[PDB]
């Protein structure tokens, strides 16, 4: 009974309806590719490894995990039906960080920064 991580969110589901839309293509090519290069992106580039980071309570509190590594794979795999489903995953990722941690925490400042930028970039999407 060592701590383990849960399986990650799925990034493939052949039975799920999906599309490659202009807006989804933009979410990959512009928005995620951008965010992924930010100085504060690194904690969010993969599922939280609660074993490595010694956070045995993380997955007790966070029951809908999400990260930008899972997002990237989903966009690459054309997993989504529309851009809104993708934007929802970004919001879950941010909101998870705010739930688990506290205002003022370094990890919270990082999320807040990425989130301001994500919002700036999706303010105008393709048609």
């Amino acid at each position: 009974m060592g701590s383990t991580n849960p399986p990650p969110p799925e990034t493939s589901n052949p039975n799920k309806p999906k599309r490659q839309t202009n807006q989804l293509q933009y979410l990959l090519r512009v928005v995620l590719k951008t965010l992924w290069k930010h100085q504060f992106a690194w904690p969010f580039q993969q599922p939280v490894d609660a074993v490595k980071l010694n956070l045995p309570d993380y997955y007790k509190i966070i029951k809908t995990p999400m990260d930008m590594g899972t997002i990237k794979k989903r966009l690459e795999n054309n997993y989504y039906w529309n851009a809104q489903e993708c934007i929802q995953d970004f919001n879950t990722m941010f909101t998870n960080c705010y739930i688990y941690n506290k205002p003022g925490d370094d990890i919270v400042l990082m999320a807040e920064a990425l989130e301001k930028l994500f919002l700036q970039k999706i303010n105008e999407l393709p048609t």
């Binding site: 956070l55 045995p56 688990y100 941690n101 370094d106």
Partner: peptide, 7 residues
Amino acid sequence: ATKAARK
């Protein structure tokens, strides 16, 4: 657990 020291 926490990700950092309490500020």
